Structures are given as C-alpha cells and as structure tokens.
Amino acid sequence: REASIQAEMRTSMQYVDRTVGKATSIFILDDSKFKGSKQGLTREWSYIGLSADGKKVMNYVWNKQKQDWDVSELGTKSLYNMKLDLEFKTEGAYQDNRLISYNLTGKYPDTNNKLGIDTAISALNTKQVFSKVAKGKKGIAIAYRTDPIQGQMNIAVSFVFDTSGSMDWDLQGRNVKKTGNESRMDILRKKSVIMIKDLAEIGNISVNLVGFSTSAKYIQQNFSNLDNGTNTIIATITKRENLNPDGVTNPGDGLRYGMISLQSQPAQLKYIVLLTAGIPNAYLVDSRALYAGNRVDLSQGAGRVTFNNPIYDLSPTLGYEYSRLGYDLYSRDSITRENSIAYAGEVSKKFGLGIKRVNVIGFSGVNHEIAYGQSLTDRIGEGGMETKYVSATNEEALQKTFSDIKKQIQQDLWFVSGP
C-alpha cells in the first residue's frame, strides 16, 4: 500500500499552499539563488525549498529578531527515505488572482518507476508574483515575505516632451481652432498630470521635466520627489505660460538634457520617458563643425540648413546657438532626418550609462508623423539600455501607455528590490 507516501507528499503540498496563501510577494528561484541550505539566502526573504540534501522539503523563515532563518520541516512527518523533486511554475491566472502549479514527484533509492502527484494548481491572494529563473532552469525554491518591502532604492524619471509646432494641432493633424478638439499639448498636459498622480504611488521616486523643440529647454531642471507633494510638478506642467508648442523637432538635445539630469541624481534606477509627435528634423553641432563650406545655408531658399560633416554637440555644457543648428522645416530631407536621429544616438551612447529603460512614445493621429519613432528608439538603443517604443493614436491610448509605463516601473522596483 504505497498510498501512504503519496498522501504524505500531498499533505506537504497542502502545507505549502497554506503558507503561500499568506504571502504578499512571491519569487520563483532556481539553482542559482537556492542550492539547498542557507547558502546564498537573501535577507528578509523566507523560502520554501527542496533541502540541500534532497529528501526533506525545507521551509526557511525569517526570525527578524536574531536576524536569521529558522529551518523547519515542511508538514510534520518524514518520508521513508525517498528521492524527492519539487518544481513551481506560474500557470497563468484566474479572474484577478494568479495561479501557481506545484509539482512534487519522487523515486526511490536505487530503483525506477517513480511515483507522484501529477501537478497541483493554487491561486494566490496577491498579484506581486515574479520568476527569477532563467534559460534552462526549473524553479525549485520559492521566496516570499509577509509584510511589504520596508522601503527600497529610489527611482528617477525624466520627462522629455515635444514642444514643437506639430504639437499645437489636433492628434489627427487637423487645425487647432477649426475643430472643437484639444491640441496634442493640452491632452499631453492632462495625461501627464494623471501619470504624475498615479506615479507617486510607487513611493521613493522623483521626476523632472525637460522640453524639446528647435532646441531643448529645462521646464523643471530640479528632480522633485513626489513623496513631498506632487503639486510642485503638476503646477509647472499646467502652467499656461511655459510649455507651449514652437519650433522644429530636435530629439537629440532633449535626450542630452534628460540623460545628464538623470546622471546627476543618486537614484540607482533611472528612466527617461520621451514623447515626440513629428518626424525628427533638427540637431546641434559642435563649435568645431563651423569651419569652411561645411554649413550649407538653404534656410531662406529651400527652408533648411545642413552640415556636410556634422560634429554633434555632445559637450556637458548645455547651450544653443542658431549658427550651430541643422534643420529642415519641411522634414523632407533624408540627410537632415538621418543626422537628427544619429544625434540622439550619439547622445544616448555618451550620456545614457546607468539608465534602466528609455520609453519612446509617439503621440500622433497622423499615421506618418510618427513613422520614425521605432527607428529613433532603435537608434537610442545603441546606448546599451532597455528601450521600448509605443505609439498612442488617441487620448485613451496615451493614458493606457502612461499607466503601463508606471506598471513596468513598479515591476522593476519589486524585482530589483527583494530578490
């Protein structure tokens, strides 16, 4: 009657579900983060593992008093010297609950035809569940906590927004006043304020505002922590005087300003949210590029000024001079377009070292005004950081992407904080 050992492993899994249901956060670990005993065990995170030897399902708890783990035997009995194997997986989710699938199996010393409890399914009462297993692992241990992480590293966020003429029109590109619609800038103000409000919910996060047009401008150069009142930023955002559309689209300068402001801050989690609503058509060059017939001035003739051998302005000193500007008001010159994108590429390559991710949002109803958002995002990707491009064609879509960006920020915080 082998039903005894099978029922034993089932009782053990019942104990596991009982303990997991009470957890606020879950993390599936592997051979790296759990090789049995307290080896490599991370502070303040209780576990549930297969026991370094391999036959007693172990449960390590956090004493928090003696600052140590309290080894305990899962359930209360002990099997009859059987070879165990445990494996956890994230099997999707029910309505708003997430499902886990414990899989306990075992064989017996120097024999075959193992025995097992096929695969269970347990729904957790939380949503903060992640997996820290990789490429060829299984997930053999479980990490959790009862009370939330009692405060962790801070986050820095730079909002590089477009403030060009292409932002005064509709989303759908029609006229400003000829239609009863709100300009891209107005809707950006609304959605950005909503983002700011729901962003402070992360806690320990500070955001600054950078605006780019023909050149870049610091709307709020000081990184104000939302924990001390979000109203400090919202005001500057809704301030009717500043932040109005004017000029060509120069993303390189905006990236430079945002990345430098992020490099300054001490938060070990830096992010840049860039919003553009037009094809890139401008860039800034170094004073050196102002040599012989290197600057072709078709400004009054064909409406543009280009540089044959552009030496992009990548100096930490932020300044603007019309004489060092390359642009194409009609955004029809492929040379100026490619150079405007390469400018942001070099800027990201130099000022984007400790940046976690760069979110590029193309906010435009015109199907072609944001045709290079993906290209610009990929170019910025050369800096060696995570880059995500997204297109928002309506107010609802813009709010959806802003909310999703906040969600991803919280997931990176929870993941980085608490393994």
XYZ file of C-alpha atoms in Angstrom:
419
model
C 0.000 0.000 0.000
C 2.168 2.865 -1.307
C -0.730 5.328 -0.960
C 0.874 6.370 2.339
C 3.910 8.124 0.832
C 1.778 9.662 -1.931
C -0.665 11.073 0.622
C 2.350 12.302 2.600
C 3.692 14.357 -0.292
C 0.139 15.651 -0.833
C -0.046 16.738 2.803
C 3.279 18.517 2.312
C 1.948 20.372 -0.732
C -1.130 21.287 1.316
C 1.168 22.857 3.911
C 2.968 24.703 1.098
C -0.291 26.172 -0.221
C -1.290 27.120 3.321
C 1.960 29.058 3.779
C 1.948 30.600 0.291
C -1.641 31.856 0.547
C -0.491 34.108 3.412
C 2.340 35.631 1.339
C 2.236 39.147 -0.102
C 5.021 38.662 -2.673
C 6.278 35.561 -4.475
C 9.511 34.825 -6.352
C 10.344 31.554 -8.108
C 14.050 30.763 -7.595
C 16.429 28.295 -9.261
C 19.798 26.550 -8.878
C 21.465 29.965 -8.649
C 19.535 31.554 -5.782
C 18.841 28.324 -3.867
C 21.311 25.456 -3.794
C 19.822 23.935 -0.678
C 20.647 25.275 2.772
C 21.011 28.944 3.791
C 23.701 29.149 1.091
C 23.201 32.449 -0.765
C 19.860 33.066 1.003
C 18.845 36.738 0.706
C 17.954 38.848 3.763
C 14.319 39.300 4.873
C 13.044 36.722 2.345
C 11.589 33.475 3.672
C 11.867 30.418 1.465
C 10.324 27.029 0.686
C 12.900 24.664 -0.838
C 13.816 21.061 -1.543
C 16.518 20.869 1.200
C 20.198 20.798 0.103
C 20.407 17.033 0.623
C 17.161 16.368 -1.246
C 14.684 14.391 0.860
C 13.088 16.730 3.442
C 11.068 19.527 1.879
C 12.527 22.511 3.763
C 10.881 25.817 4.764
C 13.201 28.645 5.847
C 11.523 31.529 7.705
C 12.863 34.939 8.788
C 13.224 35.355 12.537
C 13.856 39.137 12.207
C 14.871 39.130 15.900
C 18.040 37.039 15.800
C 18.243 38.116 12.125
C 18.400 34.535 10.885
C 16.467 31.817 9.103
C 14.642 29.203 11.134
C 14.954 25.858 9.388
C 11.753 23.841 9.754
C 10.387 20.588 8.357
C 7.515 21.040 5.918
C 4.390 19.496 7.355
C 5.234 17.397 10.388
C 6.240 13.865 9.271
C 9.212 12.458 7.343
C 9.015 10.172 4.307
C 10.604 6.711 4.194
C 13.882 7.786 2.579
C 12.524 8.692 -0.863
C 14.242 10.781 -3.557
C 12.253 13.991 -3.990
C 11.914 16.557 -6.788
C 9.906 19.783 -6.460
C 9.061 22.336 -9.151
C 6.989 25.546 -9.123
C 5.579 27.343 -12.179
C 3.352 30.322 -12.992
C 0.354 28.775 -14.780
C -1.419 31.932 -15.940
C -4.151 33.448 -13.796
C -7.837 33.306 -12.846
C -10.091 36.441 -12.790
C -7.590 38.688 -10.936
C -5.755 36.007 -8.925
C -2.511 34.453 -10.108
C -2.103 30.684 -10.345
C 0.884 28.613 -9.218
C 1.490 24.957 -10.076
C 3.364 22.903 -7.506
C 4.736 19.674 -8.981
C 6.066 17.163 -6.431
C 7.465 13.858 -7.670
C 9.790 11.213 -6.278
C 11.648 7.973 -6.943
C 13.121 5.527 -4.508
C 16.814 4.826 -3.691
C 18.368 2.580 -6.361
C 15.138 1.715 -8.243
C 12.850 3.013 -11.006
C 9.164 3.680 -11.805
C 8.832 6.844 -9.698
C 5.571 7.886 -8.025
C 3.803 11.149 -7.951
C 1.159 13.778 -7.512
C 0.744 14.892 -11.149
C 0.662 18.700 -10.815
C -1.365 20.853 -8.436
C -2.783 24.331 -9.089
C -3.001 27.018 -6.421
C -4.372 30.535 -6.750
C -2.579 33.209 -4.760
C -4.363 36.048 -2.999
C -1.880 38.665 -4.279
C -0.518 39.958 -7.601
C 3.157 40.595 -6.719
C 4.458 37.276 -8.051
C 7.572 37.059 -10.247
C 10.004 34.450 -11.547
C 13.778 34.663 -11.061
C 14.631 31.549 -13.079
C 16.328 31.729 -16.471
C 17.111 29.937 -19.782
C 17.307 26.286 -18.728
C 16.280 26.211 -15.108
C 13.131 24.811 -13.484
C 12.232 26.819 -10.378
C 12.991 24.646 -7.367
C 12.564 27.114 -4.482
C 10.022 29.761 -3.518
C 10.818 33.113 -1.902
C 8.249 35.294 -0.152
C 7.543 37.821 2.608
C 4.623 38.638 4.894
C 4.902 42.413 5.147
C 5.822 44.657 2.184
C 9.435 45.578 1.465
C 10.040 48.243 4.101
C 11.321 50.858 1.658
C 13.996 50.434 -1.029
C 16.159 52.313 -3.562
C 14.741 55.459 -5.176
C 13.722 55.965 -8.812
C 14.459 58.945 -11.066
C 12.308 59.812 -14.083
C 12.981 62.459 -16.746
C 10.049 63.580 -18.928
C 11.442 64.688 -22.308
C 8.369 66.164 -24.012
C 7.915 67.546 -27.520
C 7.027 71.264 -27.689
C 7.130 71.838 -31.452
C 4.532 73.420 -33.738
C 3.375 69.899 -34.581
C 2.005 69.834 -31.014
C -0.373 72.788 -31.425
C -2.591 70.893 -33.933
C -5.085 68.057 -33.264
C -3.942 64.487 -32.691
C -5.410 63.725 -36.152
C -3.382 66.646 -37.505
C -6.297 68.906 -38.347
C -6.226 72.610 -37.476
C -6.144 73.905 -33.899
C -9.171 76.253 -33.861
C -11.043 74.997 -36.937
C -12.155 71.943 -34.913
C -13.590 71.606 -31.419
C -10.744 69.300 -30.418
C -7.913 69.789 -27.951
C -4.335 70.238 -29.119
C -1.814 67.439 -28.571
C -0.240 69.665 -25.942
C -3.483 70.017 -23.949
C -4.120 66.263 -23.911
C -0.460 65.688 -23.079
C -0.864 68.020 -20.093
C -3.933 66.127 -18.868
C -2.470 62.637 -19.346
C 0.904 63.671 -17.893
C -0.764 65.049 -14.767
C -2.650 61.769 -14.394
C 0.648 59.902 -14.780
C 2.290 62.075 -12.109
C -0.581 61.450 -9.694
C -0.611 57.669 -10.142
C 3.210 57.630 -10.297
C 3.764 58.814 -6.715
C 2.023 55.602 -5.604
C 5.376 53.862 -6.110
C 6.996 55.915 -3.358
C 10.671 56.935 -3.337
C 10.506 58.375 -6.851
C 11.388 61.800 -8.264
C 10.626 63.195 -11.728
C 11.861 66.264 -13.621
C 10.559 67.938 -16.784
C 12.564 68.643 -19.957
C 11.088 70.181 -23.081
C 12.480 69.930 -26.602
C 11.707 71.947 -29.731
C 14.205 73.601 -32.127
C 16.400 73.175 -29.038
C 15.984 71.656 -25.572
C 14.773 73.580 -22.532
C 14.516 72.670 -18.848
C 10.911 73.171 -17.795
C 11.803 71.872 -14.306
C 15.512 71.028 -14.025
C 15.234 70.092 -10.332
C 14.200 66.500 -9.584
C 11.345 66.971 -7.106
C 10.320 63.910 -5.104
C 6.582 63.314 -5.367
C 6.617 61.965 -1.795
C 6.847 65.594 -0.584
C 3.809 66.768 -2.540
C 3.235 66.125 -6.238
C 1.666 69.590 -6.668
C 5.174 71.018 -7.172
C 5.417 69.374 -10.599
C 1.754 69.419 -11.690
C 1.758 73.213 -11.385
C 4.726 73.621 -13.732
C 3.004 71.147 -16.061
C -0.286 73.040 -16.157
C 1.427 76.451 -16.094
C -0.189 78.100 -19.112
C 2.790 80.394 -19.669
C 5.535 77.824 -20.176
C 5.405 74.609 -22.217
C 3.786 75.857 -25.434
C 4.471 74.450 -28.940
C 7.075 76.267 -31.052
C 9.887 75.250 -33.436
C 11.173 72.113 -35.166
C 11.650 68.647 -33.619
C 15.173 68.174 -32.172
C 15.194 64.972 -30.066
C 18.980 64.912 -29.608
C 19.060 67.966 -27.349
C 16.109 66.703 -25.319
C 17.841 63.369 -24.788
C 21.050 65.157 -23.788
C 19.306 67.293 -21.164
C 17.277 64.396 -19.757
C 20.176 61.942 -19.623
C 22.508 64.455 -17.978
C 19.882 65.350 -15.364
C 19.486 61.630 -14.656
C 23.247 61.077 -14.413
C 23.334 63.750 -11.716
C 20.737 62.133 -9.370
C 21.751 59.308 -6.987
C 18.734 57.021 -7.558
C 20.117 53.716 -8.862
C 17.010 53.280 -11.103
C 16.909 55.987 -13.784
C 14.290 56.252 -16.551
C 13.567 58.579 -19.476
C 10.081 58.947 -20.931
C 10.418 60.667 -24.304
C 7.384 61.896 -26.238
C 7.595 63.018 -29.862
C 4.832 63.884 -32.326
C 6.765 64.575 -35.509
C 9.485 63.326 -37.818
C 12.936 64.325 -36.459
C 14.315 67.279 -38.413
C 16.935 69.086 -36.302
C 20.257 68.745 -34.497
C 23.035 70.711 -32.793
C 26.683 70.537 -33.859
C 29.905 71.353 -32.037
C 31.568 74.736 -32.479
C 34.332 72.918 -34.391
C 31.918 71.985 -37.192
C 31.762 75.710 -38.022
C 34.730 75.550 -40.427
C 34.830 76.114 -44.227
C 31.906 75.358 -46.546
C 30.611 72.700 -44.165
C 27.397 74.620 -43.398
C 25.040 74.776 -46.389
C 22.536 77.562 -45.666
C 19.391 76.883 -47.719
C 17.307 78.487 -44.960
C 15.838 81.340 -46.961
C 15.925 79.420 -50.251
C 14.776 75.841 -49.594
C 13.929 76.258 -45.896
C 16.793 74.324 -44.270
C 20.429 74.425 -43.065
C 22.630 71.333 -43.181
C 26.172 70.253 -42.331
C 28.235 68.037 -44.626
C 30.494 66.605 -41.882
C 28.447 67.028 -38.682
C 30.296 67.052 -35.363
C 27.360 66.585 -32.992
C 27.383 68.788 -29.892
C 27.864 66.278 -27.066
C 29.516 68.577 -24.516
C 28.059 68.511 -20.978
C 27.719 72.303 -21.238
C 24.116 72.797 -22.397
C 23.838 75.750 -24.774
C 22.101 76.689 -28.010
C 23.202 78.903 -30.912
C 21.356 79.331 -34.202
C 24.685 79.230 -36.058
C 25.233 75.654 -34.778
C 21.780 74.364 -35.772
C 20.908 71.964 -38.580
C 17.257 71.705 -39.582
C 14.680 71.039 -42.294
C 11.396 72.873 -41.672
C 9.628 70.674 -44.245
C 11.076 67.398 -42.838
C 11.598 66.220 -46.426
C 15.413 65.974 -46.481
C 16.592 62.444 -45.720
C 20.091 63.703 -44.863
C 18.820 66.036 -42.137
C 16.464 63.322 -40.853
C 19.204 60.695 -40.602
C 21.524 63.195 -38.914
C 18.807 64.221 -36.449
C 18.389 60.577 -35.458
C 22.147 59.924 -35.310
C 22.437 62.907 -32.960
C 20.170 61.230 -30.416
C 22.093 58.008 -30.998
C 25.436 59.569 -30.054
C 23.828 61.451 -27.154
C 22.416 58.210 -25.765
C 25.731 56.437 -26.340
C 27.526 59.008 -24.175
C 25.065 60.251 -21.501
C 22.993 57.068 -21.022
C 25.189 54.798 -18.884
C 23.173 53.867 -15.793
C 19.755 54.178 -17.429
C 17.437 51.220 -16.946
C 14.975 51.967 -19.743
C 14.037 54.618 -22.292
C 10.361 54.747 -23.256
C 9.676 56.434 -26.605
C 6.033 57.429 -27.056
C 4.849 58.530 -30.496
C 1.755 60.664 -29.824
C 0.118 61.485 -33.151
C -3.063 60.838 -35.099
C -1.253 61.436 -38.388
C -0.137 57.961 -39.478
C 3.219 59.263 -40.775
C 4.262 61.996 -38.309
C 5.433 59.159 -36.019
C 6.794 56.888 -38.743
C 10.328 57.148 -37.308
C 9.509 56.568 -33.640
C 10.625 52.945 -33.863
C 13.740 53.962 -35.812
C 14.608 56.649 -33.258
C 14.032 54.182 -30.413
C 16.310 51.590 -32.009
C 18.978 54.236 -32.618
C 18.806 55.279 -28.961
C 19.110 51.577 -28.113
C 22.768 51.731 -29.165
C 23.481 53.240 -25.741
C 23.139 49.808 -24.125
C 19.924 50.273 -22.141
C 16.434 48.834 -22.390
C 14.369 50.724 -24.986
C 10.625 50.400 -25.620
C 8.769 52.167 -28.415
C 4.992 52.652 -28.253
C 2.504 54.575 -30.413
C -0.518 56.378 -28.936
C -3.097 57.465 -31.531
C -5.843 58.634 -29.113
C -6.259 60.074 -25.598
C -7.291 56.665 -24.309
C -4.220 55.065 -25.878
C -1.927 57.728 -24.405
C -3.318 57.187 -20.908
C -3.035 53.419 -21.389
C 0.641 53.633 -22.265
C 1.371 56.032 -19.390
C -0.313 53.662 -16.923
C 1.550 50.692 -18.400
C 4.841 52.578 -18.039
C 4.072 53.113 -14.355
C 3.266 49.401 -14.009
C 6.592 48.431 -15.583
C 8.411 50.849 -13.260
C 6.813 49.199 -10.234
C 7.692 45.742 -11.558
C 11.342 46.739 -11.982
C 11.352 48.121 -8.435
C 9.784 44.980 -6.942
C 12.085 42.719 -8.976
C 15.317 44.610 -8.254
C 14.237 45.188 -4.623
C 13.740 41.887 -2.841
C 15.461 39.082 -4.571
